[PDB]
Amino acid sequence: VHLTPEEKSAVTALWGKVNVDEVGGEALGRLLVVYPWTQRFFESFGDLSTPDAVMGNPKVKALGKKVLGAFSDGLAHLDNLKGTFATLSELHCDKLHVDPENFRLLGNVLVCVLAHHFGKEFTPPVQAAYQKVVAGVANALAHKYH
Amino acid sequence: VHLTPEEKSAVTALWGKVNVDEVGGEALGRLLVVYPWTQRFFESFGDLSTPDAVMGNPKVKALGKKVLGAFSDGLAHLDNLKGTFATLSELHCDKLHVDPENFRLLGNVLVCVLAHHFGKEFTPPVQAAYQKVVAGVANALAHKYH
Amino acid sequence: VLSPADKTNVKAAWGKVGAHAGEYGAEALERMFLSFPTTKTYFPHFDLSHGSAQVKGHGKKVADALTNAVAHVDDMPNALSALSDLHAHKLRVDPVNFKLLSHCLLVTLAAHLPAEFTPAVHASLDKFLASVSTVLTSKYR
Amino acid sequence: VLSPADKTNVKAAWGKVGAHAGEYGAEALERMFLSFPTTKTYFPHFDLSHGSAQVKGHGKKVADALTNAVAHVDDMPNALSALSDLHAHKLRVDPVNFKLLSHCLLVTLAAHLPAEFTPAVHASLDKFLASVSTVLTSKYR
Numbered sequence A, B: 001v002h003l004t005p006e007e008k009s010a011v012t013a014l015w016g017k018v019n020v021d022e023v024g025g026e027a028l029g030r031l032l033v034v035y036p037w038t039q040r041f042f043e044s045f046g047d048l049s050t051p052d053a054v055m056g057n058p059k060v061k062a063l064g065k066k067v068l069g070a071f072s073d074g075l076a077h078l079d080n081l082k083g084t085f086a087t088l089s090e091l092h093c094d095k096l097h098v099d100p101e102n103f104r105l106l107g108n109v110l111v112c113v114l115a116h117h118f119g120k121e122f123t124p125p126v127q128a129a130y131q132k133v134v135a136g137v138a139n140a141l142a143h144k145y146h
Numbered sequence C, D: 001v002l003s004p005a006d007k008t009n010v011k012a013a014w015g016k017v018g019a020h021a022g023e024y025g026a027e028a029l030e031r032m033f034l035s036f037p038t039t040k041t042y043f044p045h046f047d048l049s050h051g052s053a054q055v056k057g058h059g060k061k062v063a064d065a066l067t068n069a070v071a072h073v074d075d076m077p078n079a080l081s082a083l084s085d086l087h088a089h090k091l092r093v094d095p096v097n098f099k100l101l102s103h104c105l106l107v108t109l110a111a112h113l114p115a116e117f118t119p120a121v122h123a124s125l126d127k128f129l130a131s132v133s134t135v136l137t138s139k140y141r
Ligand code: HEM
Pocket: A038, A039, A041, A042, A063, A066, A067, A068, A070, A071, A088, A092, A096, A098, A102, A103, A106, A137
């Protein structure tokens, strides 16, 4: 996609307020709760028997920090998401075998989490900017699949 | 998008055998039979009440000719599909108010019609090449929406 | 299917919307139009400017339909019968857009109900909107 | 949502397929893997090359479940119950993928049914596969 200058600024401003580790565990937890089939990758992660357990699971939080950590970092290169994520792309395809649809589901769970976290600050135009970003990151992550 | 050299060659080869008028009418007709909500854009086209009526409708046939004509023309420009269909994209959004999801449906119906018409000759590799093409035309046609 | 837990969670969460139903519907629509511009193709006849009477009004219609749905969650095909007919035969909105509005409805609820939007409730609401969407598209073909 | 005409059409088409159902199943998967590479993510334990016996074997199973569904086209959720469990809880195939294989099954049928694959039968087959897809994903959450 293509963000207007104003849109990039809005994404950046909001993200400076984000506790990446907290939001990462929340988003990945929420994905495993809302779309349980996403748990398929985590048979070794421990207890996922309940929402609380999934949200409370330290391995989920642990991976959460890393996934949103890489997301956070990529926001520095909104102008080259393709390139920024090409190598995680190859990895997720060649070794992790993660259906790219998982990236879209996570992207939308993240938007809900930002909305829940920031409330009214997360205005319709701010969301519209972030939808471009999550679609952009998801696209970028799926681009090296083959 | 991004057809391999051999995918380009497969598309070109099969398309040499396509009766664009015949196929365009068949594909547009099947769109309206298989996904009847798509008839919402064709209120003036007359009788669409039964499958035989949709398929034999001269206005559906006529438009089919034009639509697949434009598709055919774009096959000469597989590296520049966005630029090729920018004008028609603006048309479909600003004047015709056509949900770009319709482009994806038509693309898939066109694939079914090619398979039906050509049988075994529409091999899985040739299908793959056409799938990239239709996804690309649909994307090119959606690009100027706002 | 909506479990009993889903049904309790949705009634709880939407009950909280109460008299904001209109406002939230309108906001969900505005979010959709801005986030997903292709959806505006179904409303070429609307003033889609922020705060338009038309959007605020359609927002209330959508929310009230949802309140209806929640009220008769155990019997939604019947409760939404006229509306599913309307979408199937007249409006003819491609089914993919239901997921777009549904997502904007979730985002809206999340932004307004910090206390009520828990992971389990988020899940129930998502299933609920998906189920409403299914009813609304059940007669398309 | 399958009308008597749809059932008749499905039975006619799948009848013509007859003993080829298995071969067509494998062909549909091959078509899916080449046209939609992301689907290969669920088969890191398969050799996916053309002619692969694993794909042939999986194709036969897929085809058989469809034959079984056709035979129980009035009572599908139960016929496909074990498959719903398997997909929902073990395989965990993202639901978007069912549309891709359904499309590929359609293309495969189109390529093998010159006479049978009329617009009306195309419509019915598409609805039938959507229904099968729905049933297969109904237990996901
Ligand atoms: C913005 C979206 C995502 C980003 C930026 C991302 C990025 C990453 C990163 C940085 C790693 C660590 C790799 C390493 O240490 O070499 C990783 C691993 C992994 N990811 Fe992703 N990911 C995303 C989405 C997802 C989703 C939605 C799923 C599944 C539902 C997933 C499944 C996995 C799995 C199973 C691993 C391996 C974890 C481990 O080995 O401990 N990813 N990802």
